[PDB]
């Protein structure tokens, strides 16, 4: 319902609220299915590379999948 109502948001805050809602939906997916969560994580990272929680969660999921074989990514994020 929040995503449906996002169409009525003022354009100034529309980008920020869309990013927030997509992050929340990606969290719900990560609870349900990690693949869609990672997809939305990539979508938001392309949309806003400056956000940290998205990158943290994406790298954390990658480390879970790669058994901590992305130490370079963690160092770069640090």
């Amino acid at each position: 319902q929040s995503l449906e109502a996002l169409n009525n948001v003022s354009p100034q805050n529309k980008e920020a609220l869309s990013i927030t809602l997509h992050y929340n939906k990606a969290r719900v997916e990560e609870v349900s299915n990690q693949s869609e969560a990672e997809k939305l994580y990539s979508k938001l990272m392309e949309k806003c590379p400056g956000y940290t929680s998205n990158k943290i969660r994406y790298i954390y999921l990658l480390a879970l999948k790669s058994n901590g074989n992305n130490y370079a990514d963690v160092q770069q994020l640090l």
Partner: peptide, 6 residues
């Protein structure tokens, strides 16, 4: 520096 991030 991004007003969007702020």
């Amino acid at each position: 520096d991004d007003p969007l991030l702020k």
